[PDB]
Amino acid sequence: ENKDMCPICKTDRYLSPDVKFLVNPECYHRICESCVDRIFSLGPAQCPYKGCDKILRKNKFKTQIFDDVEVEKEVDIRKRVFNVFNKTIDDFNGDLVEYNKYLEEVEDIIYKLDHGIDVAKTEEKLRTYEELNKQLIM
Amino acid sequence: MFFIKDLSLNITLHPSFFGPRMKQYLKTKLLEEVEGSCTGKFGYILCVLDYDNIDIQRGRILPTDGSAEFNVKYRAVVFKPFKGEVVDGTVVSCSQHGFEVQVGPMKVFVTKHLMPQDLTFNAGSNPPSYQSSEDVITIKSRIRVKIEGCISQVSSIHAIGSIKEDYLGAI
Amino acid sequence: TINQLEEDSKILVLRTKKDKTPRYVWYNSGGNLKCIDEEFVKMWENVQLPQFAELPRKLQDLGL
Ligand SMILES: [Zn+2]
Ligand SMILES: [Zn+2]
C-alpha cells in the first residue's frame, strides 16, 4: 500500500520514492532499502514490522509485483514442491488416470502446506520430500 | 592476501661502501630493510623473489654528506589485508573487549560487540577463554574471522575482524 | 475563560505574569499546535534556506 511499506518509512511518496521495498520470504513484510540494509548489515535480526519477531536473514531477497501473500506463498511452495516431485511416474507411459491422481496428490500436499493444518501432516510431507530427493539421487 | 608485486626502493650508501663489491652490499641492504618490515601502501612485505637478476640502474650522488642514492626495481612477495575478507587465525592475547586473533604477521582484533550474544567472556579460566553455547574460544584454538576494516598506517597495519555472521567462529 | 477557551476560541499574548498581562482579542481557527515537539521546532529553526533561485533548483532536483 501507499501508506505502509516500512514501519519507519511508511510515507515516502513526497520524499521522492527512489528506494525499493524488499520482502523477506521468512517474514512477508515490506522494508525499504535504507532500513533493511542496516538490518542485515548490523546482524541477522528480526524486523520491527508491527512487532515482528521472525528473524530477517542476510540477502536472499526478491522483487514483488504484488499478487497477495497467499498466492505468492502458494506459487513459491507450488514451484518448490513441483521441483521436488519432478516428473516421477508422469509421462513414463502415457496414462491419464494415474497421472491425474498423482497430480491431485501433489496439489493436495501443496494445499496442506499452504494451509498448515496442525503442523503434523506437513512434517510427513517434508519426510516425503526427503524420500523423493533420495529417489532422485539414486 | 598473499600477492606478488614489483617494488622500487631508494637505497642510501655511505662513501665508505664504494668498493668494487658494492653491488652485493646493495642487495644486502635491499634484504635487511625490505624483508620483514611493513609499508602502509603495499602491506606487510614477506619475501623478495629474484635475487640474481636485481636491477641496479645508475647511482646518483646527492649534494651534501656525499652519500649515494640508488633506485632499485625488484619483485617481492607481500601480504596486504583487505576490508571484509574472510581469513583464519589463532588467538594469542585475550581481553575483555575481545580476543586478538593472529593472522600471519597481522594481529587482528575482534570487538566484543561484534560477537554473537551466546558467546560470553570467561575470566575464571586459565587462560581466560570465551565460552559460547557450543564452542570454547581459547588461545590455541583456531577461529575463522571475517575482517571488516583495515588501517594502513606507515610501517604499521592493524585490522578489525568479526565472527557474528554465519559460517564463522571457531574452526 | 481565556484559559478554558482552548484552540483559538480566545487568544492572547502572555507578556509578564506580574502586570495583569496586557491582553489581546483576536480569533482564527486552531492556533494551539503545541503538540509540535520543541525538538522539532529547534530542528526547524536550524534550517538555512538557500536564497535567490538556488531553492527552486534544489527542489526540482529532488522532484518536488
Ligand atoms: Zn524505512
Ligand atoms: Zn518480519
How many residues can be counted in chain A? Answer: 138
Question: Which residues on A lie below 8 Å from B166 (Cβ)?
Answer: 44, 58
Q: Is C30 on the interface with A (CB under 8 A)?
A: no
Residue written as grid cell 620483514 = B36
- Helix/strand/coil (H/E/C) assignment for every residue in chain B: CEEEEEEEEEEEECHHHCCCCHHHHHHHHHHHHHCCCEECCCEEEEEEECCCCCCCCCCEECCHHHCEEEEEEEEEEEECCCCCEEEEEEEEEEECCEEEEEECCEEEEECHHHCCCCCEEECCCCCCEEECCCCEECCCCEEEEEEEEEEEECCEEEEEEECCCCCCEEC
Residue written as grid cell 498466492 = A71
Question: Which residues on A lie below 8 Å from B165 (Cβ)?
Answer: 43-44, 58
Q: Which of B148, B139, B78 is nearest to B108 (CA)?
A: B148
Separation in Å, CA of C31 to nearest CA in chain A: 26
Residue written as grid cell 519477531 = A53
Please count the CA atoms within 13 angstroms of the CA of A60 that sit on its side-chain side. 11
Q: Which three cell numbers stand for residue B132?
A: 559460547
Question: Which residues on C lie below 8 Å from A13 (Cβ)?
Answer: none
Look at the domain B1-84 and name its fold.
Dna Ligase; domain 1 (3.30.1490)
Separation in Å, CA of C59 to nearest CA in chain A: 11
Question: Hey, is A4 helix, strand or coil?
Answer: coil
Q: Where are the domains of chain B?
A: 1-84, 85-171
Q: Which three cell numbers stand for residue B106?
A: 597481522
Separation in Å, CA of A56 to nearest CA in chain B: 13
B170: Cβ–Cβ under 8 A, 6 or more apart, which residues? B135, B136, B137, B141, B142, B143, B144
Q: Which of B56, B55, B45 is nearest to B13 (CA)?
A: B56
Question: Hey, is C17 helix, strand or coil?
Answer: coil
Question: Is B85-171 the same fold as B1-84?
Answer: no
Question: Hey, is A35 helix, strand or coil?
Answer: helix
Q: What whole-number distance in Å separates Cα of residue A43 and Cα of residue B166? A: 10
Look at the domain B85-171 and name its fold.
OB fold (Dihydrolipoamide Acetyltransferase, E2P) (2.40.50)
A-C CB pairs within 8 A amount to: 4
Q: Is B107 on the interface with A (CB under 8 A)?
A: no
Q: What whole-number distance in Å separates Cα of residue A98 and Cα of residue A85? A: 15
Residue written as grid cell 503545541 = C34
* Method used experimentally: cryo-EM
CA closest to C60 among chain A residues: A16
Q: Is the peptide bond before B15 cis (omega within 30 degrees of 0)?
A: no
Please state whether beta strands B136-137 and B85-95 pair in parallel, antiparallel, or not at all (unpaired).
unpaired
CA terminus-to-terminus distance, chain B: 19
Beta carbons of B98 and B60 less than 8 angstroms apart: no
Please state whether beta strands B2-13 and B68-79 pair in parallel, antiparallel, or not at all (unpaired).
antiparallel
Going by the DSSP 8-state scheme, the letter that residue A79 receives in this structure is H
Task: Please indicate whether chains C and B are in contact, defined as at least 3 beta carbon pairs under 8 Å.
Answer: no
Q: Is B165 on the interface with A (CB under 8 A)?
A: yes
Name the resolution in angstroms: 4.7
Going by the DSSP 8-state scheme, the letter that residue C47 receives in this structure is P
Residues with their C more than 2.5 Å from the N of the next written residue in chain B, i.e. before a break, are none
User: What angle is formed at CA B103 by the lines to CA B101 and CA B107, rounded to 5 degrees?
Assistant: 55
Nearest 10 degrees: Cα torsion B135, B137, B140, B142: 70
